[PDB]
Amino acid sequence: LHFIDQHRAALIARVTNVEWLLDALYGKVLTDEQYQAVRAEPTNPSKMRKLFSFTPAWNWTCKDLLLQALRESQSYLVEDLER
Amino acid sequence: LHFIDQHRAALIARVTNVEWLLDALYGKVLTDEQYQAVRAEPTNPSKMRKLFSFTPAWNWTCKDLLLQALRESQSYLVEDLER
Amino acid sequence: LHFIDQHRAALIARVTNVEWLLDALYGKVLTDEQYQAVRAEPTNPSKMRKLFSFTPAWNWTCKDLLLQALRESQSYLVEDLER
Amino acid sequence: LHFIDQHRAALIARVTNVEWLLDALYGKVLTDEQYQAVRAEPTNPSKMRKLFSFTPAWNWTCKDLLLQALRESQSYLVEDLER
Amino acid sequence: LHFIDQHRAALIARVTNVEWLLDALYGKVLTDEQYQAVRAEPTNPSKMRKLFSFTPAWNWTCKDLLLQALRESQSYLVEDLER
Amino acid sequence: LHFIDQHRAALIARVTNVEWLLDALYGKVLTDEQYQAVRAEPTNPSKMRKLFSFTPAWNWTCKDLLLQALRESQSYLVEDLER
Amino acid sequence: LHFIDQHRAALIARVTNVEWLLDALYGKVLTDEQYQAVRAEPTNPSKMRKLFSFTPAWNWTCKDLLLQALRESQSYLVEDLER
Amino acid sequence: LHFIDQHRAALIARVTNVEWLLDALYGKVLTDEQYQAVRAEPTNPSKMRKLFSFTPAWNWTCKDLLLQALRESQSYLVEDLER
Amino acid sequence: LHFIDQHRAALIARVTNVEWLLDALYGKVLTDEQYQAVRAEPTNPSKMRKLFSFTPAWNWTCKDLLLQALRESQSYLVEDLER
Amino acid sequence: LHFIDQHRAALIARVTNVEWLLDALYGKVLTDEQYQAVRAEPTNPSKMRKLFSFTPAWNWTCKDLLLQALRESQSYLVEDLER
Amino acid sequence: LHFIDQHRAALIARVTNVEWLLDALYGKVLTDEQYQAVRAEPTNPSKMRKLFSFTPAWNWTCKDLLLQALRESQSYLVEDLER
Amino acid sequence: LHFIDQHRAALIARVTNVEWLLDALYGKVLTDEQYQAVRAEPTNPSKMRKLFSFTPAWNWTCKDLLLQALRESQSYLVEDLER
C-alpha cells in the first residue's frame, strides 16, 4: 500500500531477500520478462530500483500483495520502518 | 477505442510494459520503421508519446486492438482507470 | 521461412536457447559484430528482439536456416506453435 | 503439467533432489549446456530457479515428464502440495 | 543553496554517487519522468548535467535539500570543495 | 489567469517540465497540430515561447487550466514567483 | 552504380548493417562530418536516408564502392534485389 | 548491536566457528535459502562476508542475538575485541 | 583571443570536448538558453558552429577565457594549431 | 595519495587482494552499494577499475587511507612500484 | 601515427583488448569523461568507434602513443596488418 | 588455423579440457586478464565462447598454436572432426 511509497528510499537500500519477493509476485503482478529483467540486475539496490520502476502501473491491491510478501520475508524490517 | 483517447494522459504516465504492446501491434497496426522509432526512445513516457503520435490515422479497430493488448498486459491498470 | 514471421511474437517470448541458434547462424547469416550485439542483451526476449531486428535483410534461405536451427534446438516448441 | 505452474513458488523452495530430476530430463527435454548451467548453481533454490527458467519453451508433454520424475523422486512432496 | 551554483562545474565532474541523490530527491523535487530521464544517461557527468538541467525551476529549499543529500552522501567532496 | 501574463518572461525562462503541461492541456486547449508544433522546438525556452504564441486566443478558463497544471507540476516555481 | 538508384526505396527499408558500410566509405567518399551526421540518426531507415542525401554529388565510382561494400556485407540482400 | 558494526573487519577475518552461529540464527533471523547460501562459501572469511551481506535489513534485536551467539561460541574473541 | 578567430575553421572541425568548454564558459560568457541551444546540436562541428555564432558580441576577455579552457582541455590541439 | 594516481595502470593490473582493501575502506570511504558494486565484478582488474571509478570524489585523506591499506596488505607491491 | 588512420577499418573490427589501451592512454590523451564514455559502449567495435571519434584532435605524438600501446598489447595484430 | 573456424560450433559444444588449453596459450597469445576472464565463466561452452571472442585479433600462427594444443589434449576430438 502507501507504505511502499512512503518508505521507498529505505526499502531500496535495506531489502536483502529479493528473490523471495519475486517468487511471491510472479504470475499475478509480474510477467516473465519483468521477472527476468529484475533478476538480471547486479546488486540488491539495483534489483530493488528495477522492481520499483514497474510500480506506476500498480493499484492498491498489488502494493498490498508486495507488503504482505515483505511481512512474511522480513518481519523485523517492517517493524523497524514502522517504528 | 475511445478509452485510449479519454485516458491518454494517464496512459502515457503509467504504462510500464511497452515492448509487449509493440509486439502485439507489430505487422497489423505498426510498420517496421514506426516500431523502430518507438523503440529508440529513452524512457517509458517518451515511448508512449511516440506511439500516441501515430494514433490520428487509426480507426476504431486499431484502438480496440491496443485496448485488448493493454487488458492482456496490465489488467490492474485498466481496471484502475475504469474505476 | 514465413513461419518465423507468422509466429514472431510467440518466438520472442518463448525461445530459451539463443546461444545455440547464434552459433548455428554465425558466419553465414550473422557477422561478428551482430553476434556480439545480440550477446550484449540482458534477457532472452531482449536477445530475441535484437536478433529479429536483422531479419528485414534476410531472404527465404536465411529464414529456412533459422527454422532448421530451431527444429534442432527446440523440437517441442515448433510442434506446439504449429498445432 | 499445470501442476508445476500452480506450485512454482513451493517447488522452488522445497525440492531437495535436483540431480535425479536432471538425469531424468537429460536428452529428452534438456540439452547438455542447459544441464551444465543448472548443475553450476550454488544452492537448491538457485538450481530450481535456473531449471524453471527453461520452462516457457515446454509443452504439456515436457511438464508431464517433469511431474512424473517428481512423483518418482519425492512422493511425499507431491502429496503434501496436492492436499 | 548557492553552493551548487558556485561549484557547478566541479560537481558535474566529481560526483560519483548519483543514484543515492536521486532517491533522496525523488517525490519532492523530482517527478517520475525526470527521475527516469536522469537514470537513462550513460555516464556520471551526463547524469549530473541532466539533473542540473532541471535546476532553473528550483527555489532555495530544493537546492538546500540537494546540498543536504550531498553532505550525507559525500562528506569529503563537500569539505574539499568548501576548503 | 492574469498570473501567466504578469510572469510571462520568468515562466519562459524557468519552466522545465513542458511535456506534462502539454499533456494536461491536450484536447481541451490545444489541438493536435499545435501540440506537435510545440513539441518540435529544440530547447525549453523555445517550447515555452511557442506555447505562449497561442495565448492571445485564450479566455480566463484556459489560463486557469494552465495555472492549475503548473501548480500540479512545479509547486515551488509558482510559490517562488508569487513570493 | 545505377543499382543503388534503381533500388533506392528497398535499400532504405532493408539494410541493417550501416556502420560497416560507413567504415568502408570513410575517408574516400565520406568526410568526417558527414560520417558523424549519418551516425547520429536514430534508426536504420533514418541513417540510410541521411546517407542517400549525399549521393547527388557522387560519380559512378563512388556508387560502385557502395555496391561492393553491400555485396561484402549482405550478399543475400543484393541477390534478393537482383532476383 | 553496534558491536558488530564497529568490529566488522576484525570479525570477518577472525571468526572460526561459523556453523554454530548459523545454527543459532536459523529460523528467526535467517531463512533456509540464506542459510544454504552462507554454507556454500569456500572459506571462513567468505562465509562471514556472505553473512554480513544480510545485515542491512536487521534491527537491534537481530544484532543482539548475533552478539549473544558470539559470546557463547567465542568468549575470548569478544573480550579481545572489547579490550 | 585573436587565436580563435585565426583558427576558426580548424577549431570547428577538430574540437572533440565541447561539453567541458560549455561548463567552463557557463554563467560568465554563456547564458542558460545559449548553453541549451549549443548542447541541442547533433554533432561536434554543429555544436562548435553554434558556439561560434555567439562570438560577435564577445570582447578580448571572453575569447581569452575560451582559449584558456581549450589549453586546459586539449593541450595538444592548441600546440598543433600554433605549430 | 598522488601515488595511486601515478601508478593507476600498474595497480589495476597487479593488485590481487581486493576484498581486504574493500573491508578496510568500508563505511568511512565506501558506502554499502559501492561495496556491493565492486564485489559484483568478475575478475581482479575489473574490481580494481570499478574501485578506481569512485576516486574522483575522494580528497587526499581518502587516498592516504587506501595507500595505508595497500601497505598493510601488499608490502612488496608498493616497494616494487616505488623502486 | 598514420598507421591508425590507414588501418582504421581493420582496427575497429579486430581489436579485442580495449581496456588495456584505455588504461595506457588515460591521463595523457583521454580525460576521465572520455574514458567513461568509451567504457560505456556495449561491444568491442562500438568501443573502438567511440575511441576513434576523439582522434581528430590528436597530433602525431598521441597517435604514436596509441600505436605503442597496440604493439605492447597485440603484437600479432600489428604484424599481420603491416604485412 | 582455418580448422578452428571451420569447426567453431562443434568445438564450442564438445571441448572438455579448457584449462589445459589456457595454460598452453598463457603468455604467448593470452594476457593475464583474458586468462582470468575465460576462467571466470560457469560452464565449458561459456568458456569456449569467451575464448573464441578473442580470436578476431589472431593471425595464422596463433590459430596453429591453439590447434597444436588441441591435438595434444584431445586427439580423438580432432580426428572425429576431421573425418
For K20, which residue in chain J has the nearest alpha carbon?
Answer: J9
Spatial contact of G27 and K52, defined as CB atoms under 8 Å apart: no
Cα(I69)–Cα(I20) distance, rounded to whole angstroms? 8
Q: Which three cell numbers stand for residue L19?
A: 584449462
Beta pairing partners, K30: K26
Residues in E touching F14 (Cβ below 8 Å): 56-57
3 state DSSP class of D54: coil
Cα(G15)–Cα(G6) distance, rounded to whole angstroms? 15
Query: Would you report the helix, strand and coil content of chain C in percent, each value rounded to 5?
Result: 75, 0, 25
Spatial contact of C65 and C28, defined as CB atoms under 8 Å apart: yes
Nearest to D80 by CA among D11, D5, D1: D11
Residue identified by cell 525523488 is E26
Nearest to E4 by CA among E46, E65, E57, E72: E65
What does the buried/exposed string (b/e) look like for F23-46 if buried means 16 or more CB atoms within 10 Å of the residue's CB?
bbbbeebbeeebbebbeebebbbb
Spatial contact of A59 and B78, defined as CB atoms under 8 Å apart: no
Contacts 24+ apart (CB under 8 A), J43-46: J43/L33, J43/L36, J43/L37, J43/L40, J44/J15, J44/J16, J44/J18, J44/L36, J45/J12, J45/J13, J45/K19, J45/L33, J45/L36
Residues in E touching J53 (Cβ below 8 Å): 16
- Test H59 with A73 for CB contact under 8 angstroms: no
Neighbours of H25 (CB within 10 A): 19
Cα(E83)–Cα(E79) distance, rounded to whole angstroms? 6
Distances from the Cα of J42 to the Cαs of A7, J12, J32, L20, L37, in angstroms? Answer: 33, 14, 18, 21, 7
Neighbours of H75 (CB within 10 A): 10
Neighbours of L34 (CB within 10 A): 21
Spatial contact of D70 and D78, defined as CB atoms under 8 Å apart: yes
For A46, which residue in chain J has the nearest alpha carbon?
Answer: J33
- Domain with residue J23: its CATH number is 1.10.533.10
Spatial contact of D26 and D35, defined as CB atoms under 8 Å apart: yes
Residue identified by cell 544452492 is D43
Spatial contact of K13 and C33, defined as CB atoms under 8 Å apart: yes
- Test B36 with G13 for CB contact under 8 angstroms: no
Cα(B58)–Cα(B65) distance, rounded to whole angstroms? 11
Contacts of L35 (CB under 8 A, 6+ apart): L22, L26
Closest CB to E57 among F15, F19, F20: F15
- Which amino acid type is present at position K45? P
How many Å lie between the alpha carbon of J43 and the closest alpha carbon of chain L?
Answer: 6
Spatial contact of H63 and H4, defined as CB atoms under 8 Å apart: yes
Tell me whether residue J12 is exposed, middle or buried, using C-beta atoms within 10 angstroms of its C-beta: 0 to 12, 13 to 18, 19 or more. Answer: buried
Q: Which three cell numbers stand for residue H9?
A: 573487519
Q: Which DSSP string do the residues of chain G spell out, in sequence order? A: -HHHHHTHHHHHHH---HHHHHHHHBTTTB-HHHHHHHHT-SSHHHHHHHHHTTGGG--HHHHHHHHHHHHHH-HHHHHHHH-
* Alpha-carbon dihedral sign for residues H32, H37, H39, H40: positive
Beta pairing partners, E30: E26
| H44-H49-H53-H54 Cα dihedral, nearest 10 degrees | 30
Neighbours of K69 (CB within 10 A): 18
Cα(F9)–Cα(A54) distance, rounded to whole angstroms? 38
Question: What resolution in angstroms does the PDB record give?
Answer: 2.9
Three-class SS of chain E: CHHHHHCHHHHHHHCCCHHHHHHHHECCCECHHHHHHHHCCCCHHHHHHHHHCCHHHCCHHHHHHHHHHHHHHCHHHHHHHHC
Contacts of I81 (CB under 8 A, 6+ apart): I3, I7, I10, I11
Q: Which three cell numbers stand for residue C26?
A: 554465425
- Test C26 with L8 for CB contact under 8 angstroms: yes
3 state DSSP class of H54: coil
How many Å lie between the alpha carbon of J71 and the closest alpha carbon of chain H?
Answer: 17
The answer to whether chain J touches chain L by having 3 or more C-beta pairs less than 8 angstroms apart is yes
Cα(F31)–Cα(K33) distance, rounded to whole angstroms? 43
Count of positions (residues) in chain G: 83
Q: Which three cell numbers stand for residue L71?
A: 591435438
The parent domain of residue I50 ranges over: 3-82
Contacts of B59 (CB under 8 A, 6+ apart): none
Residues in I touching F13 (Cβ below 8 Å): 32-33
Residues in J touching H11 (Cβ below 8 Å): none
CA angle, residues J29, J31, J35, in degrees to nearest 5? 100
Spatial contact of D52 and D12, defined as CB atoms under 8 Å apart: yes
Element (H, E) at L13: helix L8-14
What's the number of domains chain K is made of? 1
Distances from the Cα of E10 to the Cαs of J61, K35, K66, in angstroms? Answer: 19, 18, 29
Q: Which three cell numbers stand for residue K37?
A: 564514455
Beta pairing partners, C26: C30
